[PDB]
Copies of this chain bind each other. A is one copy, B any other.
Amino acid sequence: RIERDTMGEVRVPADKYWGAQTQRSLENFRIGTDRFRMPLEIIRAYGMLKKAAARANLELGELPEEIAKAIIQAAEEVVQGKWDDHFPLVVFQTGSGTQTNMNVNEVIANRASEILGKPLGSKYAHPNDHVNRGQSSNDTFPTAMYVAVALALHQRLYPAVEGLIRTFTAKAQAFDQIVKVGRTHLMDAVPITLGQEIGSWAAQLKTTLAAVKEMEKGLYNLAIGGTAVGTGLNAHPRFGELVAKYLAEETGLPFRVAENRFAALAAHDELVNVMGAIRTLAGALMKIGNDVRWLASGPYAGIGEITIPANEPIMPGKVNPTQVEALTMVVVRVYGNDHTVAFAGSQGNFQLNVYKPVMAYSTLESINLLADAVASFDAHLAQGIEPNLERIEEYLQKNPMLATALNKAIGYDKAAEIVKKALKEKKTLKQAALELGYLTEEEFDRIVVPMRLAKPH
């Protein structure tokens, strides 16, 4: 079809619901078109915002009853993802996300007009005067992105991490009776149990996940209502308040208007902190991932104290740790995303930080990739972790760390000799102690109890 405005006539695909402005933008912004389409999470959140906005304005007498109801309906459709294919703009547009705001306004306006029995392009429901009433791209984009990130955390990241925590916790309980060598500086230290080792991974995830959930609270403070620079000019005094209330009712999260609307436009420090906590979580996943591949290294020239499930339905102990590699590659990508967000966050100027799209994009990318990788790592590796009892035992029984009990039982002299023999002849302390006649294969087991070292209290 052909839409007409004071700027001229533009041709838009007859099946598309965006308007002339979006069509022009689609033809002008060509940076990263293939991989950087504006995240749909932002679009869905924008739908929620526009829906709450129509309701607020209607209630405050800023919009005609019928037109408002049509907008509310059209907006809800966007939220339900019925118009995802009508948003073709990239992340690399204006630093205020103006193009996407107008894309949202045009699609919802045209659909609203259609609902009201008007052909697309009529603007019966005006994109700017109605759908964008009392709003600016300046305050609505950051509002939409804060909501998008908060929802993405609950929808994808938390379920994935909480799932892996449950898996590790289950494995930790199941293997808590298996005593093994503990290592510090990568060197043989003292005994621990495989359950204690795996439990530490679960603990790191609980600790880092808790921090993400705490930082998440900063996202509850929205810029909505401050309009262009934070003064709220052109918006009803209660517009922001109501929009926040409705967003909170729809999401179940305690959203509210930021105590200071100026800072909510000039910076996005709350988002920076959320990304930072996600980065720390990623760091813990790298630590855990590496522990896993090192413990599974082998079959014979590594550590090999645990085995991981085959990558494709190669015997146990010879499986390449593919899930660790995919996970850690995601982790290094996440650290880079954090760098991008924090760097951008320090670059605001006066009344508006103009790096909003990329800050939102890199944070969402991190959330989605981590959610994908954690879920994959969990289902395809973590859940199938098993101990290699033979390897664990061989290391423990032949290690000097078990000589402790001997020193008090038969004196250091004899114990030291037993250890020296075992190491020299590559035998277990029990075997050496037997070939020396210092202790029977019976007395040894009564004096040397590995679990007493791993659980000394």
Most buried by B among A197, A207, A303: A207
Q: Answer whether residue A155 sits at the interface, using C-beta atoms and an 8 A cutoff.
A: no
Cα A273 to Cα B283 with chains together (Å)? 11
Q: Flag the segment in A49-57, A63-71, A198-206, A435-443 that touches B.
A: A198-206
- Of chain B, the residue at the smallest CB distance from A401 is B315
Cα A117 to Cα B357 with chains together (Å)? 52
Given contact pairs A36-B35, A94-B326, A187-B297, A351 touches B263 in the complex (Cβ within 8 A):
no
Chain A interface extent, by class: 35 or more
Contacting pair A369 B273 (CB below 8 A): no
Copies of this chain, how many? 4
Task: Give 10 new A-B contacts, CB below 8 A, not counting A189-B228, A197-B350, A211-B218.
Answer: A32-B330, A94-B320, A96-B325, A186-B321, A203-B259, A203-B263, A287-B346, A325-B355, A328-B355, A335-B340
Q: Answer whether residue A387 sits at the interface, using C-beta atoms and an 8 A cutoff.
A: no
Cα A233 to Cα B179 with chains together (Å)? 14
Query: From residue 346 to 361 of chain A, which have CB atoms closer than 8 A to chain B?
Result: 346-355, 357-358
Q: Answer whether residue A5 sits at the interface, using C-beta atoms and an 8 A cutoff.
A: yes
Contacting pair A231 B181 (CB below 8 A): no
Q: Flag the segment in A141-149, A245-253, A449-457 that touches B.
A: A449-457
Contacting pair A358 B333 (CB below 8 A): yes
A-B contact pairs, 8 of them (CB 8 A): A91-B329, A96-B185, A184-B352, A197-B351, A208-B273, A273-B277, A300-B399, A332-B344
Q: Flag the segment in A21-29, A72-80, A107-115, A118-126 that touches B.
A: A21-29
Contacting pair A332 B340 (CB below 8 A): yes
Q: Answer whether residue A254 sits at the interface, using C-beta atoms and an 8 A cutoff.
A: no
- Of chain B, the residue at the smallest CB distance from A377 is B31
Cα A189 to Cα B290 with chains together (Å)? 19
- Of chain B, the residue at the smallest CB distance from A372 is B31
**B98, B189, B276, B287: the one within 8 Å of A229 (CB):** B189
Cα A277 to Cα B287 with chains together (Å)? 21
Contacts of A299 on B, CB cut-off 8 Å?
Answer: 187-188, 398
Q: Answer whether residue A269 sits at the interface, using C-beta atoms and an 8 A cutoff.
A: yes
Contacts of A419 on B, CB cut-off 8 Å?
Answer: 316
Contacts of A183 on B, CB cut-off 8 Å?
Answer: 229, 297, 301-302, 349-352
Contacts of A234 on B, CB cut-off 8 Å?
Answer: 456
